[PDB]
Amino acid sequence: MKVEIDSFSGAKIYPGRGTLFVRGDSKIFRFQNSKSASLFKQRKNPRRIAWTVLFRKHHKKGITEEVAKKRSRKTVKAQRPITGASLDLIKERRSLKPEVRKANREEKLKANKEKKKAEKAARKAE
Amino acid sequence: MKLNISYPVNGSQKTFEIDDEHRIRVFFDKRIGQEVDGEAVGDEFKGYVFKISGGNDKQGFPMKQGVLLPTRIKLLLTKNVSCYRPRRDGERKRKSVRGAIVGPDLAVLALVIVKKGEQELEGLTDTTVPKRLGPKRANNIRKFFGLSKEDDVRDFVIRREVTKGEKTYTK
RNA sequence: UGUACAACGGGGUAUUGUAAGCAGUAGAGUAGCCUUGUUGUUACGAUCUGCUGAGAUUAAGCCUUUGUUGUCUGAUUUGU
RNA sequence: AUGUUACCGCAAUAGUAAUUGAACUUAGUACGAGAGGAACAGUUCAUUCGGAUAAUUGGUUUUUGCGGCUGUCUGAUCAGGCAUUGCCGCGAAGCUACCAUCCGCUGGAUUAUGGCUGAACGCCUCUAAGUCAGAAUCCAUGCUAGAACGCGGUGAUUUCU
RNA sequence: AGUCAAGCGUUCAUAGCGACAUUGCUUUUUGAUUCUUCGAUGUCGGCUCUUCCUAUCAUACCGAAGCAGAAUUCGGUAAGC
RNA sequence: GAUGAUUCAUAAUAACUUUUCGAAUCGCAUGGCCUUGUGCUGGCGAUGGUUCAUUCAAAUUUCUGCCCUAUCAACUUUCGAUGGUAGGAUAGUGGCCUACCAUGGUUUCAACGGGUAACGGGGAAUAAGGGUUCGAUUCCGGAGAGGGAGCCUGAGAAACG
RNA sequence: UGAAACUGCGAAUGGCUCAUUAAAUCAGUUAUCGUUUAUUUGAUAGUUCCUUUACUACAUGGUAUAACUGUGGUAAUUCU
């Protein structure tokens, strides 16, 4: 067995109890009882009918289901290596960042290097 | 059914071919983004907690988030949206999908881990895949490393050594 | 003169579809007020929303009662 | 009316009921040159008829139960009256429907007919004496009523009247 | 519905038919008659509903065939249905 | 200042804007001033960008011209037909659409309706001249993607590879 | 040097057919003082910090996301 769901009222339909209807477009409806069935043939709207589950959930009655939506308070949390970076040495270079004299000496090296570069280039142009 | 579980920090992922139908009735009537019990699916995941990322049902039509029903439906999808890539700007298209509630129609359910329990997992936590690419932007390097405003980011770059013959180079 | 019976009451089960009463910075709009608001205030106004799956009916041939109030010797006939 | 009264029974007699088809399988087998084309057993269903029943579905609705609607009357509201049960939707309970469901028995003697042994008629023959199997038949099992002049078992049998 | 059997049926009267002749049955036909009924028996059909007969259409069991099978024809007990 | 002619170009007051555009783009060569430095300047280009003009377009639009039919003589206006006013919509005028108002507009000088083996034209066949017939078909303009309807992207589609 | 992918353009041109359509298309001829116009072509943004003094990097600022890695799902799809 199964316990299906009325099209109109939205009520559990235990086996045998109730009717089934098959419209020309092959849509299969179920009705627990002739109340729901007769109303359907009258072409009523369940959102307008008061005792139906559809009205209940559209007018927000018995709303103890929902509370709120959760949110995670953090970051991706993965400072992993790039397969060519040696994560150990990566943290090592982060610690090597203070006393930044290396890049300063590289700049001082490259400054005199750029000097001699322009010098020899100007010499060749003459 | 199957559980495609993933650990995003380690970047690891593995499929698990699940049976024990009552130990998956717990998964029934659950939406996307919802969190169910590690012990209920498996004592190997006792204490663990996941987050339902998504999944494929039968006939391969994926689960879309947000539709909030279990039966399959036909939506007029568009760009910047899951389950359809447009082959032209402006091209909308009607495609069939499955929705954001879990039921017997599903075949594979995709999960992601948010907390690591007391015991250990074979294929997720003991391994870790690297970052396929390094940061191509100056400030991305600067804040990822924490250096300064002036410490010559050009030489703090990542260098990935590979050999053509015996000549090796970082490209 | 009793796990007695009955009449009311309670509970359940059902039927119907959200009672009257109050309130609303809800309401097509329309008249009048002025310190012309920023809910301005007042009069009228179907209908809507909240209390309210509320209210009503429920054995008359439904079920069940730790409740209440009562009732329980009138007539006639019968012999191997 | 059988002494009174009550309970449990017997069973004379009378009535009687179940009926037919399809499909699958047997089997494209038997049979037939081929064409075509069966049957018994088994299973699942149906036709016609009967006897009940209302869980479900449908109908019925004076539950005048709940709601709504018109006209009018009770100053207005609330709540109601009247409209030959005012009208509409729902409507339990009850009744009811091949419009719903369930159920519808097996033993003996027989006809026709085929036989067994067997003479008359030294053979032969179902028959003459005897005897076997055999039908929707007949009679019992079962079902209905129970002679109001058919019967049985058991209980209690009146007082200071 | 019988008796007889010249013939039909490829051959053969009878599997099935059966001319010419002849013997019966029934009263569901229609005549013939005028017994009862003219001081009145309500007069056709249909509807409804029961029961009876068998001269059996079907169904049960059988017999015969010019019945290989299928289909059919003749006949028996049978009016239960 | 121009115009055939403007409430034109254009300028300035007073505000509106959720605020448009006013280069965080790219390639070569790398050069000069010295206050001797990653100091300041500097070239040839590509991309994109607000406005205007231009160009390739596009859309509406003035005048004239189309086959056979009166065995089609009245057509249009319900529910836009003709105009006016106002507004919406448009990229823009405009019944294009809406509200109100006036009752107009077309017609024998062939309206309107029917048929068409009708896409139109530049042209093609045939001839002294006049002309008759054909023209789907290489070029120009239309329409369509099986019939209809709708819409996204875009400067440009009511798109059908 | 260099596939794939993001981006930017183009895919509205071309090509095919002649079903519709008889003041409609179309041909010549006017207007846009009644409008849109990518692209080309020529010109064209000293004025954008809004208690505009610490309110803020301008030798320059923030975010993915594809391609890819691997887990994959349908019988099939230029499917995801």
Is A87 in contact with B129 (CB distance < 8 Å)? no
Q: How many CA atoms lie within 13 A of B143 on its CB side?
A: 3
Q: Do B145 and A93 touch (CB under 8 A)?
A: yes
Residue with tokens 């049902």: B57
Is B144 in contact with B73 (CB distance < 8 Å)? no
Nearest nucleotide relative to B6: CA against C1': G71
Nearest nucleotide relative to A13: CA against C1': D56
- Nearest residue in chain A measured CA to CA from B154: A103
Long-range contacts at A11-17 (CB < 8 A, ≥ 24 apart)? A11/A36, A11/A53
Chain B residues with CB within 8 Å of chain A CB? 8-11, 33, 114, 128-134, 144-148, 151-152, 155-156, 158-161, 170
Instruction: Give how far the C-alpha of residue A118 lies from the chain's centroid of Cα atoms, to the nearest Å.
Output: 57
Residue with tokens 């002739």: A34
Cβ contacts of B134 on chain A, cutoff 8 Å:
82, 85
The total of other beta-carbon atoms located within 10 Å of residue B114's CB is 14
Q: Give the separation between CA A32 and CA A21, rounded to whole angstroms.
A: 11
3-state secondary structure of A35: helix
Q: Is the CB atom of residue A13 positioned under 7 angstroms from any atom of strand D?
A: no
